[PDB]
Write a protein that binds this ligand. Structure first.
Ligand code: SAM
Ligand code: ZN
Ligand code: ZN
Ligand code: ZN
Lengths: 104, 94, 78, 245, 92, 101, 78, 103, 89
DNA sequence: TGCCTGGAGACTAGGGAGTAATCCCCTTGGCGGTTAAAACGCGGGGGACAGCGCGTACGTGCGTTTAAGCGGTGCTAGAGCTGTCTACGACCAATTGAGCGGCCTCGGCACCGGGATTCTCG
DNA sequence: CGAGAATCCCGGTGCCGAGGCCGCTCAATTGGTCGTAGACAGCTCTAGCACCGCTTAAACGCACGTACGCGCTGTCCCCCGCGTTTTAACCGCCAAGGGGATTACTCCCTAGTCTCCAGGCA
């Protein structure tokens, strides 16, 4: 008895996404390829942000990923900064930036 | 031995753009929230609600002082003034 | 009068994180009023959600929903 | 000395003591006026922004629509729809508020005007009124009239195509002379959609002093003329060999 | 009470792209909030697209249109490519 | 004997008169056919052989004029805060930076 | 080059409606690029809605939906 | 008799109930919600039309135009806050000149 | 189908001897639709946070108090309360 | 005005919400001790602001040129509205394995202290 | 250029939170039936595109003058680095009890169905 995530080749679940689509007042009917497509998109976005977070963790000589590493990983990429331009991350800080006229 | 004015300021800019801790104390902020939440008398608060309010408040204030600094640099000055804050909150849409 | 508990070194440290090198002497009374207006708006929305939910305790999800209503979208508290 | 009387009298041409050889004129007249203008489509009304009181005059009383009005700064007189109504002071071309003038002889250059009493700066004196020409008639009447051997040419160009004649009919502003030290001048005021030419003062002119205005210099023929004032830097002649209009 | 999460799935994604890297609980909560927010955005845009054309079923075409409107640049191209690759393998 | 011109307006009076004249009226300030050609030219880059309505271009023109008027309304405040009257492109860039664009 | 069809007195007339007294010489070349970016974004979203709706004509409700997506609600063309 | 005659309103109630049951908002819809929402919409419509009628009488007109709607909305403290991100077609702007530009 | 005749019925009660153009009628149609969508969407959000399946007058009132300003929301709540009181009595 | 399509009037069943009880978790209040941080002067160098001089870029005005509107006609791609029907999603019965909760265990990382390097300024 | 305050590097200690493991529910899975939503086909007819002649209002280009943006200089106020004193924040511990949260029972409120008939849109 294989699942639908093993049949689609994904790591995110399909039945949970299908349950959240059917129990969220979005439409009357839900197609059979929509949670597979949406789980593929969410898995791609998760891997895309975790690659940059792991690169920041390797750059700062650490093993674990912290919200400062997530803040650097989001704000150092332009497309993620455009997608998440109205998001505040707790315990993430800011970017180092000093204007060229304030310093001699 | 004394430093020229501005070196300690740039040192503080570097160390507080490097650090990630909270800058406002917790009991004065909590007493401020519990004072101005008196809307509905005899309320009650969790710790994470005030912990979220403090994060949002400090993020809002840092995001306002960045545009205040941009207005002060555009006015060909270094000192920030309340008219820069008023210009930033006028252009921002508030 | 607990708005005077937001002291001058705290506003100065927030301005040092904001990148400000030199600070005048009139910024503080403006910053306290702006902080007071922002906190009054967010606490008004949170107390409205709490009064709708038939509860006496203001939780954190009410604050997250009150920030989502204004376009802030805080992560880390659920 | 002016003595405006409708009976024609025994003075030939100089008009210094008897003004009834020619005819006088009110607000000017047109010949080929058509309904193509900005009159009543976008300049329907240009109302000032004033919140007056108008119940306290002669005691703590500011005059209505002074030098803080939106219309006086932009050289526009108000309409009848003003919030001050019949107390607004912009409408000076319509209520005919003028200055005390007199025409006698001063110098052998010709006739002119001298101030009766004291008259402050930015004060209206007289309106330039005459007969409005058009495109074709100007270049025909100037060559029809140049062969009549006249000294004084009463031509003022309102715009690039409008030139007003004040020869057949003219008010008391036709006698005013030219000098290289001007104390009065000309301005372009817009009243009721139409453009009108006035005369304002610039300084504190004493009682019994000259009131002339500066010409924007122009020649039309081959000959040249010169001025007889000589204040401090009187050129007299024109600005060289120019030929513009 | 038993509550839904995404922590084991984020851990399975993290142990493929970085075989030696840990993650803290605060970062896992930020990732859960991110997944929930992007889910709500795509589902709301798809439910808005389903009502304009007077349809009743949300399918992968509406999901693809909601992704294409919402993601900027080459990220939308790669998301459409990954989703089409995952839907193509499911039918076979 | 020459025809003299009366005077010439000081710089600023005709400009403030045009400010009042175009703040009083409500009309389209841009020519319609160059705007339509511009919209069709930039819409050829996304799908070849399209077709447009008239209200679909009218709504674009209304939105574009409102956007540009709001941008100049913020940019004039930037130029006044810079203690000037002339409007610079650095004022436009400051307005688009503080606004979030 | 139909971006030159947006003439200089049209931009000057928009600045006179916006309350600008005196204009420099590069505002026109800045405004053309700003208008080009804004129109490219709105036309991209409108053509996306049109290609989703399986039509070939671009209606006005697609433009209204794209302007609502940008956050600029327009009353009148509904 | 209709429910708009029972409640004393002018906006309909059945159309609001149909749009609540049709637009996928929840599973069930109560009984006082379309009446309450129709009263709110009628109050807001009457306020907008009252201020538009005042702005239309202030300019010697007998027909309300989008410029009169623009002046009525932008000359009010709270309607400008409710409709701050809305562009009205053929509406224009408010006449104002900064005080550092006038001579 | 629209709200045009109802906008006429509201307009003839507050200003008797006046008219309205079709463009202003379309703007009022868009305004009514926008406020309907805002209040219905916020009342749909409020019913999900408490895990309820029914939108009620309390839900609509909570969506009114969150969305409208201070002096406007009080009169809106008062008018809606009077209208829902007259419906049962 | 035609009329027809959507709104009202009764009746019933089933599950959704309202009330009561009780557990126990988590919020509020209080007392002491340490010390880090806030408060208060104080001298001085740097920057904000005012005054002045100069050259140019942008305003207003006139004559010529150009293409935006304004109608009239014609052709056709494509929007829009019905008909068939077939394949796809809702719904239920039985079942099993994946994931949430609870419990140990050890190692990445935080604090502290010594030694050497790096920028600052008179 | 050399005192002198920050600052980086290296090691040692130890600790509490990330992670593996297990027991056990409840929700994903598979099979089968039925109804209906949309996919396809086809007909009508309607605005969208293309061209053409005329008029005239707006755009363009050149001339010229003067108000303003920019650079320089002087002054004096005021914010910053530093030192000393006072204060309350933070940690730690303790205890009372109020309300979130869950479960069980029961009433009543709205979806569904059928019939009837007038309100509003062309
Ligand atoms: C308006 S009149 C001025 C005086 C006029 N001669 C009079 O007595 O009424 C203009 C005519 O007078 C002539 N004029 C005015 N001032 C002059 C002067 N200073 N020198 C020579 N001719 C002058 C000009 O030739 C012009 O044609
Ligand atoms: Zn006035
Ligand atoms: Zn007046
Ligand atoms: Zn002379």
């Amino acid at each position: 008895a294989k699942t639908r995530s093993s049949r689609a080749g994904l790591q995110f679940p399909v039945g949970r996404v299908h349950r959240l689509l059917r129990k969220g007042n979005y439409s009357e009917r839900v197609g059979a390829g929509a949670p597979v497509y949406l789980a593929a998109v969410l898995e791609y976005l998760t891997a895309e942000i975790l690659e940059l977070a792991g690169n920041a963790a390797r750059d700062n000589k650490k093993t674990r990923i912290i919200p400062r590493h997530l803040q650097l990983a989001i704000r150092n990429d332009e497309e993620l900064n455009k997608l998440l331009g109205k998001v505040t991350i707790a315990q993430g800080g800011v970017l180092p930036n000093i204007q060229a006229v304030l310093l001699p | 031995h004394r430093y020229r004015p501005g070196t300690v300021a740039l040192r503080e800019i570097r160390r507080y753009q490097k650090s990630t801790e909270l800058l406002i104390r917790k009991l004065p902020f909590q007493r401020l929230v519990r004072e101005i939440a008196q809307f509905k008398t005899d309320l009650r608060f969790q710790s994470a609600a005030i912990g979220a309010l403090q994060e949002a408040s400090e993020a809002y204030l840092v995001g306002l002082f960045e545009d205040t600094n941009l207005c002060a640099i555009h006015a060909k000055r270094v000192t920030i003034m309340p008219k820069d804050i008023q210009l930033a909150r006028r252009i921002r849409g508030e | 009068d607990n708005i005077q508990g937001i002291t001058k070194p705290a506003i100065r440290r927030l301005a040092r994180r904001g990148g400000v090198k030199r600070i005048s002497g009139l910024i503080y009374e403006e910053t306290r009023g702006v902080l007071k207006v922002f906190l009054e708006n967010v606490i008004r929305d949170a107390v409205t959600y709490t009064e709708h939910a038939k509860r006496k305790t203001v939780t954190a999800m009410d604050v997250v929903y009150a920030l989502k209503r204004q376009g802030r979208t805080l992560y880390g508290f659920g | 000395d002016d003595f405006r009387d409708p009976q024609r009298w025994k003075e030939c041409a100089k008009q210094g003591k008897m003004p009834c050889y020619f005819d006088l004129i009110e607000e000017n007249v047109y010949l080929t006026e058509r309904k193509k203008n900005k009159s009543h489509r976008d300049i329907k009304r240009m109302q000032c922004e004033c919140t007056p009181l108008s119940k306290d005059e002669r005691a703590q009383g500011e005059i209505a629509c002074g030098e803080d009005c939106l219309n006086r700064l932009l050289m526009i007189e108000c309409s009848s729809r003003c919030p001050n109504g019949d107390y607004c002071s912009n409408r000076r071309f319509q209520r005919k508020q003028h200055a005390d003038v007199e025409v006698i002889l001063t110098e052998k250059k010709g006739w002119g005007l001298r101030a009766a009493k004291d008259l402050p700066s930015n004060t209206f004196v007289l309106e330039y009124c005459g007969e409005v020409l058009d495109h074709k008639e100007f270049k025909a009447r100037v060559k029809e009239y140049a062969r009549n051997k006249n000294i004084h040419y009463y031509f003022m160009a309102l715009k690039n195509d409008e030139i007003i004649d004040a020869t057949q009919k003219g008010n008391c502003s036709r006698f005013m002379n030219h000098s290289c030290e001007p104390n009065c001048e000309t301005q372009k005021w817009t009243v009721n959609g139409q453009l009108r030419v006035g005369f304002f003062t610039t300084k504190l002119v004493p009682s019994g002093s000259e009131l002339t205005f500066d010409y924007q210099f122009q020649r039309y023929g081959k000959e040249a003329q010169k001025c007889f004032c000589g204040s401090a830097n009187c050129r007299g002649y024109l600005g060289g060999e120019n030929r513009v209009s | 009470s038993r509550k839904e999460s995404y922590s084991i799935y984020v851990y399975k994604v993290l142990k493929q792209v970085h075989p030696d890297t840990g993650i803290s609980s605060k970062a896992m909560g930020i990732m859960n909030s991110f997944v929930n927010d992007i889910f709500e955005r795509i589902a709301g845009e798809a439910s808005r697209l389903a009502h304009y054309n007077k349809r009743s079923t949300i399918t992968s075409r509406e999901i693809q249109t909601a992704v294409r409107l919402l993601l900027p640049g080459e990220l939308a191209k790669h998301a459409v490519s990954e989703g089409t690759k995952a839907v193509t393998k499911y039918t076979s």
